[PDB]
Design a protein around this ligand. Structure first.
Ligand SMILES: CC(C)(CCCCCC(O)CCCCCC(C)(C)C(=O)O)C(=O)O
Lengths: 12, 271
């Protein structure tokens, strides 16, 4: 899931 | 009066909003007002001025293979580029909401899937006036009438968003209000397929409690502003339902209007 990838990314 | 935990929640949400969204309402209303600069945004009001603006964006258009598509499709794909950006910002904003990152990951996906376009159209109102909308980080302005002049079905995309925005903007919200409103939209316990409904409802209750108290303090003369905004949340759900239907028509009837994969995932089996 592309949404899951965004959700799992480390804080910027 | 807000206790400390509630003040802290509202501050973290407002700070997250300011950090994550490039365009916000104070900036938009400076540009739209013309009172801080005599150099207004470039106005896209017809096909000639669209092509002119597109000369600046040639590198992006060629990179995505759309430079030779029909004007309406070029516009549609540039709209997608802005939506994908905003979904990305909204995901970071959501992770800054206390409690959100602790939800089951599938519930986080569900909240974003159904919430992002409600939030997008609420925030879009900030860059809209009755005559058009800011684009490209406030550097251009595309006219409402130009958007209506595009061929069907593309002329049907933005006009219902302008309609919503003119009513929403009359509420005169500021960024502190909108940040809590957007948090409430994302933290909605009524979405289809949510697993841990009761827990998400308690999260939303806290945010909506802060929203209500904040509105009573920030807009004391608009006594029922909070109920008005609850109604706007329902209007937004309907706005997005209709929007998804139109997006489905475009996918089934417009061979050149490929959806970016992230947006494809959002719309898939949505409504
Ligand atoms: C494309 C223009 C004419 C102006 C920049 C577009 C700005 C996008 C706005 O935020 C509206 C977003 C509406 C929904 C889009 C859609 C793809 C249908 C979706 O995401 O569902 C240019 O300058 O070339």
């Amino acid at each position: 899931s592309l949404l899951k990838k965004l959700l799992l990314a480390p804080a910027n | 009066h807000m206790t400390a935990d509630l003040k802290s929640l509202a501050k973290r949400i407002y700070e997250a909003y300011l950090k994550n969204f490039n365009m916000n309402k104070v900036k938009a209303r400076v540009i739209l007002s013309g009172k801080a600069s005599n150099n207004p945004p470039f106005v896209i009001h017809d096909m000639e001025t669209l092509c002119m603006a597109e000369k600046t964006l040639v590198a992006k258009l060629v990179a995505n293979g759309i430079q030779n598509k029909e004007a309406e499709v070029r516009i549609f794909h540039c709209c997608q580029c802005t939506s994908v950006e905003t979904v990305t910002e909204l995901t970071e904003f959501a992770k800054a909401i206390p409690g959100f990152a602790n939800l089951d990951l599938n519930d986080q996906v569900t909240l974003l899937k159904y919430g992002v376009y409600e939030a997008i159209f609420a925030m879009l109102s900030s860059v809209m006036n009755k005559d058009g909308m800011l684009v490209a980080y406030g550097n251009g302005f595309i006219t409402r009438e130009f958007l209506k002049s595009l061929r069907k079905p593309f002329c049907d995309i933005m006009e219902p968003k302008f309609d919503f925005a003119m009513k929403f903007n009359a509420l005169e919200l500021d960024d502190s209000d909108i940040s809590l409103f957007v948090a409430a939209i994302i933290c909605c316990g009524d979405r289809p397929g949510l697993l841990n409904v009761g827990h998400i409802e308690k999260m939303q209750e806290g945010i909506v409690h802060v929203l209500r108290l904040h509105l009573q303090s920030n807009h004391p003369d608009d006594i029922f502003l909070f109920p008005k905004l609850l109604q706007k949340m329902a209007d937004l759900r309907q706005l997005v339902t209709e929007h998804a239907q139109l997006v489905q028509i475009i996918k089934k009837t417009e061979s050149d209007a490929a959806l970016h994969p992230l947006l494809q995932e959002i719309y898939r089996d949505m409504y």
